[PDB]
């Protein structure tokens, strides 16, 4: 019975971690864009449209 509970809980935890990794990657992409905007639009004057 313990083996059954362990396998189940372990799988639920591994699923959680996977989702966190994917979400973190998307946040990283957002942060990179934010860094570019700060660099080009605040510390200077961007000319590219929109």
Residue ranges binding other proteins (CB under 8 A) = 8, 12, 15, 50
Minimum gap (Å) between residue 15 Cβ and other proteins: 8
Which pair of tokens denotes residue 4? Answer: 């059954």
HSE, side-chain direction, 13 A CA sphere, residue 50 = 0
Q: Which is nearer to other proteins, 15 or 32 (CB)?
A: 15
Q: Which is nearer to other proteins, 3 or 50 (CB)?
A: 50
Q: Which is nearer to other proteins, 42 or 46 (CB)?
A: 46
Length of the chain: 50
47 SS3 class: coil
């Amino acid at each position: 019975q313990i083996d059954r509970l362990i396998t189940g809980r372990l799988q639920s935890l591994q699923t959680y971690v996977t989702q966190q990794l994917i979400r973190a990657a998307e946040i990283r992409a957002s942060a990179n864009l934010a860094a570019t905007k700060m660099s080009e639009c605040v510390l200077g004057q961007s000319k590219r449209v929109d």
